[PDB]
Design an enzyme around this catalytic site. Structure first.
Site, mmCIF file in Angstrom:
data_model
loop_
_atom_site.group_PDB
_atom_site.id
_atom_site.type_symbol
_atom_site.label_atom_id
_atom_site.label_comp_id
_atom_site.label_asym_id
_atom_site.label_seq_id
_atom_site.Cartn_x
_atom_site.Cartn_y
_atom_site.Cartn_z
ATOM 1 N N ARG A 46 -7.105 1.718 10.173
ATOM 2 C CA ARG A 46 -5.516 1.933 9.933
ATOM 3 C C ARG A 46 -4.944 1.990 11.342
ATOM 4 O O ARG A 46 -5.220 2.023 11.884
ATOM 5 C CB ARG A 46 -5.412 3.700 9.046
ATOM 6 C CG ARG A 46 -6.601 2.947 7.683
ATOM 7 C CD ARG A 46 -5.994 2.550 6.476
ATOM 8 N NE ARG A 46 -6.368 2.632 5.770
ATOM 9 C CZ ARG A 46 -7.941 1.736 5.619
ATOM 10 N NH1 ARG A 46 -8.176 1.007 6.183
ATOM 11 N NH2 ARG A 46 -8.889 1.354 4.230
ATOM 12 N N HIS A 72 -14.223 4.550 -3.002
ATOM 13 C CA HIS A 72 -13.538 3.649 -1.708
ATOM 14 C C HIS A 72 -14.319 2.215 -1.409
ATOM 15 O O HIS A 72 -15.452 1.453 -2.173
ATOM 16 C CB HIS A 72 -12.894 4.421 -1.264
ATOM 17 C CG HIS A 72 -11.900 3.725 -0.548
ATOM 18 N ND1 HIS A 72 -11.789 2.521 0.633
ATOM 19 C CD2 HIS A 72 -10.415 3.952 -0.483
ATOM 20 C CE1 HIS A 72 -10.889 2.542 0.988
ATOM 21 N NE2 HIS A 72 -9.766 3.121 -0.075
ATOM 22 N N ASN A 96 -5.527 -0.471 -6.301
ATOM 23 C CA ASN A 96 -6.264 -1.008 -5.880
ATOM 24 C C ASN A 96 -7.208 -2.426 -7.177
ATOM 25 O O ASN A 96 -8.086 -3.213 -6.570
ATOM 26 C CB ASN A 96 -7.131 -0.983 -4.653
ATOM 27 C CG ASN A 96 -6.619 -0.015 -3.775
ATOM 28 O OD1 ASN A 96 -5.503 -0.828 -3.636
ATOM 29 N ND2 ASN A 96 -7.134 0.208 -2.342
ATOM 30 N N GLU A 131 -1.184 -7.559 -4.589
ATOM 31 C CA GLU A 131 -1.263 -7.149 -3.225
ATOM 32 C C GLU A 131 -1.858 -8.045 -2.798
ATOM 33 O O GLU A 131 -1.339 -9.009 -2.160
ATOM 34 C CB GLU A 131 -1.502 -6.003 -2.963
ATOM 35 C CG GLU A 131 -1.361 -5.607 -1.455
ATOM 36 C CD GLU A 131 -2.087 -4.321 -1.136
ATOM 37 O OE1 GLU A 131 -2.822 -4.347 -1.654
ATOM 38 O OE2 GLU A 131 -1.120 -3.009 -0.761
ATOM 39 N N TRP A 149 -8.043 10.288 7.398
ATOM 40 C CA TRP A 149 -7.218 9.572 6.687
ATOM 41 C C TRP A 149 -7.432 9.564 5.047
ATOM 42 O O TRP A 149 -7.149 9.222 4.235
ATOM 43 C CB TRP A 149 -7.540 8.125 6.789
ATOM 44 C CG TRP A 149 -7.749 6.680 5.874
ATOM 45 C CD1 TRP A 149 -6.569 6.155 5.566
ATOM 46 C CD2 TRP A 149 -8.854 6.571 4.660
ATOM 47 N NE1 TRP A 149 -6.220 5.594 3.834
ATOM 48 C CE2 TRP A 149 -7.751 5.392 3.860
ATOM 49 C CE3 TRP A 149 -10.190 6.473 4.800
ATOM 50 C CZ2 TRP A 149 -8.656 4.656 3.167
ATOM 51 C CZ3 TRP A 149 -10.399 6.318 3.444
ATOM 52 C CH2 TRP A 149 -9.662 5.266 2.553
ATOM 53 N N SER A 192 -8.099 4.255 -7.272
ATOM 54 C CA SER A 192 -7.926 5.155 -8.085
ATOM 55 C C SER A 192 -8.135 4.636 -9.950
ATOM 56 O O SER A 192 -8.332 5.529 -10.508
ATOM 57 C CB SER A 192 -6.258 5.511 -8.019
ATOM 58 O OG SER A 192 -5.555 3.774 -8.218
ATOM 59 N N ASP A 250 5.727 2.069 1.451
ATOM 60 C CA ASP A 250 4.132 1.227 0.704
ATOM 61 C C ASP A 250 3.288 2.395 1.947
ATOM 62 O O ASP A 250 3.098 3.343 1.481
ATOM 63 C CB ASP A 250 4.094 -0.273 2.159
ATOM 64 C CG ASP A 250 2.604 -0.335 1.987
ATOM 65 O OD1 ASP A 250 1.606 -0.337 1.080
ATOM 66 O OD2 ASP A 250 1.469 -0.087 3.670
#
Ligand SMILES: Cc1cc2nc3c(=O)[nH]c(=O)nc-3n(C[C@H](O)[C@H](O)[C@H](O)COP(=O)(O)OP(=O)(O)OC[C@H]3O[C@@H](n4cnc5c(N)ncnc54)[C@H](O)[C@@H]3O)c2cc1C
Ligand SMILES: Cc1cc2nc3c(=O)[nH]c(=O)nc-3n(C[C@H](O)[C@H](O)[C@H](O)COP(=O)(O)OP(=O)(O)OC[C@H]3O[C@@H](n4cnc5c(N)ncnc54)[C@H](O)[C@@H]3O)c2cc1C
Ligand SMILES: Nc1ncnc2c1ncn2[C@@H]1O[C@H](COP(=O)(O)OS(=O)(=O)O)[C@@H](O)[C@H]1O
Ligand SMILES: Nc1ncnc2c1ncn2[C@@H]1O[C@H](COP(=O)(O)OS(=O)(=O)O)[C@@H](O)[C@H]1O
Ligand code: SF4
Ligand code: SF4
Ligand code: SF4
Ligand code: SF4
Lengths: 149, 642, 642, 149
Positions: C264, C397, C73, C140, C233, C448, C360
């Site tokens: 989500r 995040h 990400n 992405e 999640w 990450s 995915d």
């Protein structure tokens, strides 16, 4: 939910039936033939109605508030007699309340279902009257209701 | 979640069958059931008829009144035995208005004219009723009277036992399905069940069957999901068994969309009736505003219902919901201000009302007193939080969901008799099958006294039906064996697939009762106007609910059970799922929001008296697997005005 | 719920203590932890320093990347290796705007200038990155690149292992508390923990400690409460351990009120990033309305936040909440329309993107693919429901909750250095104590690659700290002994009071871990802006949460454990409870609603840039048991304009 | 959650360690010394991450979707190799999907952590550069970022 005290429990000595296992409205109280002591088999299905607690050899069963919302320390202990019931409410902080309420004004097992009622008749079977009516209703006659004009 | 200590498995063919022949079979030994047993015993003599009462637990404490009750919510008082006399017309009006205009007044007026007699008998039987120094029954509100009812059920259980005889009472027997007349597709012939104490299958053959199983709880996810999943406000013991077997038999349901959302002390769900009506307690939001005042104006759009007295319960709930949506919680029951106000400085007077306050809880919802003890809440010092619980489906309380039943010949209008093949009081659309208490719809506010009373009414009608129609139903042995196999199939499935996994509760070929229940609760909570959406739903959500319930229903065929206790749990689940589907289909059918506070159809947000002032009735045809709906316009049966 | 197969009880005095001496101790072997181990091993050589990594599970798959990941990400791309190059200034702007104006830009710019190097190493080590026929990394969105990352963690684990050496890695050891310098109340000296595989108490003596335990999950009740309570999640494995031990030591927390609510795929919580950014999927309410458009007007009040591109994450959430509040669910991800549009009638193209779609999910959240399979959902034919999950607390995040940490010398402004006794990159306010990944607050969007990178940064700073300050903290043996007694107290309490009840999980003198967690989840859900109130709260609700958390904290002193597994669960609960209190206190302190969509303060519904454009930092003083808060005004560090 | 197939499981008796018990990030997989067969000790804490399934004797462990929302019948089965992973997705309705994705482009255990990196120096320790920088970043010079005036 309810829980059995090992020290006080005796798996129902020589009596004819297991009080706790007999009274539970949700079939939760049962016996562990090994220990010969009862236990709640499914606590998250306990309504905390205290039926088991009231019908057992005093102190053999207690209730510990659901963990979801109950801090530890609280307890309500019933002492059910024949004409009244005694309650002791102990707070987490040590506070202790004592109450006593009546539960019955007549002797247990003394009910005469149709005491004073006349015998039923095929004729009466066709009216709106129930057993003992209209006398038991206390009115001078069977209650009338005005129908919508 | 359930973790059995040891297995208790039996294969259908290894289980012995016990056949019981009787004339009138009462399913459910709660208040309505005991009322039926009592009255049936009286009239049965006219034909030497055998009355049989079957109960899954023990009648002494079974059902909603297990802890006892603190008041009798329905006592008209036509002579002045209480502090307040009322008329039957005022009561009927009160109920219809509370239902926002929809109530079978023939049914309400009928139990209302009989109810007082029942209450007087209860007292005669030993129930201690609160009395003033003058000897009058102490009123809570306008229609209720206070009682020292810890032993309310045991007393009523005794009356029923003395009436029908212990030899005619089968306890610890779970009824899971009704049997129909081989000779007639729309006539009942008995029912089947099984013992939860031993391997024994029961086949009850009867001429008349009376459904008195109580309503349905645990269909929706509760506000507490751990151990407290067991703290349902309404009877956790009632799982919609009557609804299931009757609808499967083809008996029509009515107002099944009308669930009840109780506003009670938070978490413990202790009673608020005495606090509101007797102690004059005020409920205020987090900022000290008495919302029944600040939200009065919002009820103006619900004319004339919004002006009734008392204000309809759903509307009072609606005011609470508005506060919740605006984020004005916690909502408090100011018990501390109520007690101070009532005692007026008199310490001895305070002590007395303080004892009455605790009895209100100790007499019917001990969990609330225990909650106060655990959280150190002294009602004379600090207020308590209150909140609406998840939905419950029943017809005896403030909800009117249940079977469409026939009324008395002298009150029922032609408009309401069309769907009944035989006109007998409290009989369903299925001949010989009656429904009482929570099982009878469209006539709520029966409560303890009213449910017992409705049972008496159906009991006499059942005897009359038997003696007049003289039925002789024959059970289909082929169906009986099929049901016996289905009865223990869960246990056989467990034995057949447990080897697929080293863990009994994690298997790909089956689900255990608690697992299917968790699933049902989540579906209903998220799509059928549960707490998750603050009781809101719409066409799309309800349609999705049906798709998910369909998956669950199919998976019921793969249910497993490890012992008799769990086998009962398995069938209680089955009963709940079908009850849930009917509730969803009913909510989907009625295109309006008549009871905001209970549920909201966001796609049809308004009350529609132009097109929906009707009872919604439905029928499930098991053979065709089709649901049919019908609208029965409401007609005012009793004379009264707003 | 937990039902141990058999007991595994030990008393503190019967458990052997193993002492481990090291220079740098890294708590947690996840992505940030492995990053620190990797970089520490490189610089450690300068002084022959010993580096020790301690993990409660197994580094090969431990933490958030257990299933693998479908994308990296954070990849800036300063040279054009991907389909889209970006600048560091544009990235810093992006993060600050996404945080609704509040982010430690010195910290963000710092990991951003280093992150690409980490990604390149990842590819060099074997991670397969999606590439175009021209060889460019497949983008992405603007900042993410797609990867075949099923083995993302095992690869990073191997790199860390090769760097630090297996003999320096301790797995299956749960750290539950830090140790401070006997002779300095604001300096760390090590940590204590215990094995979850055998009876062994650990005492780690260190000069520098790096908290890399990941964030905190399960503080709030999930949308599924049965088995699916495990389907969080975010990493169910991370329970706020770092937050707990650091705050107890006096390390200051920042933005702890900033939780993250992920939108989500419903129930399974599959990713939506690729679907939104790569597949161009549209999210619509139950009536086919694309709310990002229909609710655009509602974002105009937020300036300039509401006109930013992309729209800040909390605001995208806010648009979703408005639909939920209006009862316009289900909200659908129209994967069927997205695939058809991207394939353009080309069946071979469709098959290709169809495989990409499943990857995915299979590379990072298999549960969503399993959900589709169980519910017969084919993404090319029907849409999937989506929903926001319960709150999670983490700083790597989209949330920035974590410790207030020092930034690099060349970027950190004087305004942000005031609270640090020693100016070392990523060091907390406690000397020698560093925080990385989820544990470092105010610099989110690390994910990450960024977490691993922040670990590398803290690692080098830790070596520089040791060589420059030559720390030499002394542990307090008295405290170590008291902590060892507390470590196994739950087991001892169980043995001591288990005889009060015939049922292990129903005792009046203790609560088991799952029981205390259920209670925590309910408290947070109902009072701290959980799903129960659609993420809304106020001062009164938050104050009540503190009162209930107090009761629970006191009850933690009566926790019981039946085996090592449950003993770990007990401390994981202890860790969550304090994390939750910190969260509640922070939300209570900030009198504004800066992140509608994450949480709403109904008593302070507006964003306040006049008095609240500041970081909220707190300190817990264990000795005085007092929390102190202070506002640190945000200052723009990097050059960028709206 | 995950579950072990009694037929396939052998308690890793031929290995130096138990795969599932070793890999589970939440410490759920353990061995029942009795049967010498594994089991998930606390399924409601299972993240369904499939780590156990992947690192186990191919057909011993599988996952049965959480009962809360999963109808019966679905399954995702992985076959993990050295450079790729194979997946089979089976629908409740019988549909079967098959996929294959790469997982690594280099031999396992072949990482040389600081390959090509110069030795660390005390002078370097005082800079902002991390191991391998600035070149590993892809630029000849350390990336610069404009600070606000
Ligand atoms: C917490 C609470 C507070 C209340 N407070 C008041 C109050 O103060 N005053 C008042 O007047 N009323 C009150 N009521 C209402 C009152 O108790 C009901 O209206 C009344 O009990 C309904 O009677 P029932 O016969 O329909 O249901 P119940 O009394 O519940 O009886 C149903 C019976 O059917 C059994 N059963 C269920 N399924 C099966 C099966 N499949 N096979 C065999 N047996 C089965 C049950 O075990 C039970 O014995 C309250 C109820 C609850 C739950
Ligand atoms: C479902 C999901 C999807 C995601 N998708 C993406 C994506 O596509 N791309 C991307 O770049 N990022 C993604 N991320 C984000 C990413 O994974 C994180 O940002 C990153 O893993 C955070 O690293 P950590 O070091 O802070 O936490 P983790 O990686 O979780 O590590 C924490 C470690 O600490 C251990 N630990 C905890 N408590 C203790 C204790 N008391 N004692 C000892 N050890 C302990 C844990 O066992 C774990 O090994 C996702 C995360 C999740 C959960
Ligand atoms: N605020 C109120 N206004 C009017 N009637 C109320 C109010 N609250 C409760 N009641 C009435 O009092 C009775 C309900 O009592 P509760 O204590 O709330 O619980 S119940 O279990 O007995 O139903 C019903 O008759 C209901 O109509
Ligand atoms: N609608 C969106 N607009 C802009 N960015 C988005 C959007 N949705 C997701 N993202 C971004 O894509 C990433 C998140 O991916 P997700 O699939 O939602 O889950 S995550 O687990 O990997 O975080 C983050 O970089 C987030 O900022
Ligand atoms: S609980 Fe009480 S009634 Fe039950 S077995 Fe033990 S002693 Fe007897
Ligand atoms: S308290 Fe009631 S519901 Fe619970 S075990 Fe006892 S009798 Fe059964
Ligand atoms: S599951 Fe597989 S790894 Fe675990 S014990 Fe059984 S054979 Fe060994
Ligand atoms: S799927 Fe993951 S969390 Fe569940 S047991 Fe297996 S390794 Fe553990």
């Amino acid at each position: 939910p309810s829980f059995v005290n090992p020290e006080k429990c005796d798996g129902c000595k020589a009596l004819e039936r297991t009080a706790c296992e007999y009274i539970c409205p949700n079939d939760l109280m049962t016996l562990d033939k090994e220990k010969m002591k009862a236990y709640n088999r499914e606590p998250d299905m306990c309504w905390e109605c205290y039926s088991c607690v009231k019908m057992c050899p005093q102190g053999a069963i207690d209730v510990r508030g659901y963990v979801d919302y109950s801090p530890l320390g609280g307890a309500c202990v019933p002492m059910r007699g024949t004409s009244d019931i005694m309650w002791t409410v102990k707070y987490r902080n040590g506070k202790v309340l004592r109450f006593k309420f009546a539960i019955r004004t007549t002797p247990w097992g003394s009910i005469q279902p149709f005491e004073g009622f006349p015998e039923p008749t095929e004729e009466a079977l066709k009216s709106e009257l129930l057993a003992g009516e209209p006398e038991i209703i206390g009115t001078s006659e069977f209650p009338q209701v005005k129908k919508k004009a | 979640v359930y973790y059995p200590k040891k297995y208790e498995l039996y294969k259908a063919d290894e289980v012995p069958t016990e056949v019981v022949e009787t004339d009138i079979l009462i399913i459910g030994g709660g208040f309505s059931g005991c009322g039926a047993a009592y009255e049936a015993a009286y009239w049965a003599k006219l034909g030497g008829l055998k009355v049989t009462l079957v109960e899954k637990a023990a009648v002494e404490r079974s059902g909603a009144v297990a802890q006892g009750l603190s008041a009798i919510n329905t006592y008209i008082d036509l002579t002045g035995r209480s502090e307040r006399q009322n008329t039957l017309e005022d009561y009927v009006r009160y109920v219809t208005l509370d239902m926002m205009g929809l109530a079978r007044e023939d049914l309400v007026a009928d139990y209302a004219r009989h109810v007082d007699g029942t209450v007087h008998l209860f007292e005669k039987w030993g129930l201690p009723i609160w009395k003033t120094p003058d000897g009058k029954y102490v009123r809570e509100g306008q229609w209720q009277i206070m009682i020292h009812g810890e032993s309310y059920k045991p007393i009523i259980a005794e009356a029923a036992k003395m009436a029908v005889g212990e030899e005619n009472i089968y306890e610890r027997v779970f009824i899971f399905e009704l049997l129909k007349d081989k000779n007639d597709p729309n006539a009942v012939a008995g029912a089947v069940g099984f013992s939860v104490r031993e391997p024994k299958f029961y086949v009850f053959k009867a001429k008349a069957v009376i459904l008195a199983t109580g309503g349905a709880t645990l269909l929706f996810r509760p506000r507490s999901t751990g151990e407290a999943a067991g703290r349902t406000w309404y009877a956790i013991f009632d799982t919609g068994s009557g609804y299931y077997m009757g609808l499967k038999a083809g008996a029509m349901l009515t107002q099944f969309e009308h669930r009840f959302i109780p506003f009670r002390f938070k978490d413990g769900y202790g009673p608020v009736g005495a606090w509101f009506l007797f102690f004059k307690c005020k409920a205020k939001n987090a900022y000290g505003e008495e919302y029944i005042k600040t939200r009065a104006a919002e009820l103006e759009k619900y004319k004339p219902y919004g002006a009734a007295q008392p204000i309809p319960t759903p509307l009072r709930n609606h005011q609470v919901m508005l506060e919740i949506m605006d984020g004005n919680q916690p909502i408090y029951m100011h018990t501390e201000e109520a007690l101070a106000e009532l005692a007026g400085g008199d310490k001895k007077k305070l002590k007395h009302i303080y004892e009455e306050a605790f009895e209100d809880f100790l007499d019917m919802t001990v969990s609330q007193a225990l909650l106060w003890a655990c959280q150190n809440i002294d009602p004379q010092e600090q207020p308590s939080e209150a909140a609406p619980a998840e939905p419950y489906i029943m017809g005896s309380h403030s909800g009117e969901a249940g079977f469409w039943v026939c009324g008395p010949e002298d009150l029922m209008p032609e408009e309401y008799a069309k769907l009944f093949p035989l006109k007998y009081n409290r009989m369903t659309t299925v001949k010989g099958l009656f429904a009482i208490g929570d099982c009878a719809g469209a006539n709520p506010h029966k409560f303890s006294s009213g449910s017992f009373t409705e049972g008496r009414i159906a009991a006499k009608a059942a005897v009359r039906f038997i003696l007049e129609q003289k039925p002789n139903p024959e059970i289909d042995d082929a169906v009986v064996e099929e049901l016996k196999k289905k009865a223990y199939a869960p246990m056989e499935r467990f034995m057949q697939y447990k080897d697929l996994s080293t863990a009994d509760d994690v298997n790909p070929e089956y689900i255990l009762p608690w697992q299917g229940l968790v699933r049902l609760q989540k579906i209903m909570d998220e799509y059928a106007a549960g707490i998750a959406t603050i009781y809101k739903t719409n066409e799309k959500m309800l349609q999705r609910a049906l798709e998910l319930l369909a998956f669950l229903k199919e998976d019921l065929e793969k249910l497993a059970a490890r012992d008799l206790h769990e086998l009962m749990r398995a069938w209680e689940l089955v009963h709940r799922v079908w009850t849930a589907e009917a509730h969803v289909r009913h909510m989907l059918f009625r295109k309006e929001t008549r009871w905001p506070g209970y549920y909201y159809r966001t796609d049809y947000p308004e009350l529609n008296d132009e097109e929906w002032k009707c009872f919604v009735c439905s029928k499930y045809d098991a053979e065709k697997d089709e649901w049919t709906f019908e609208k029965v316009p409401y007609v005012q049966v009793i004379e009264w005005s707003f």
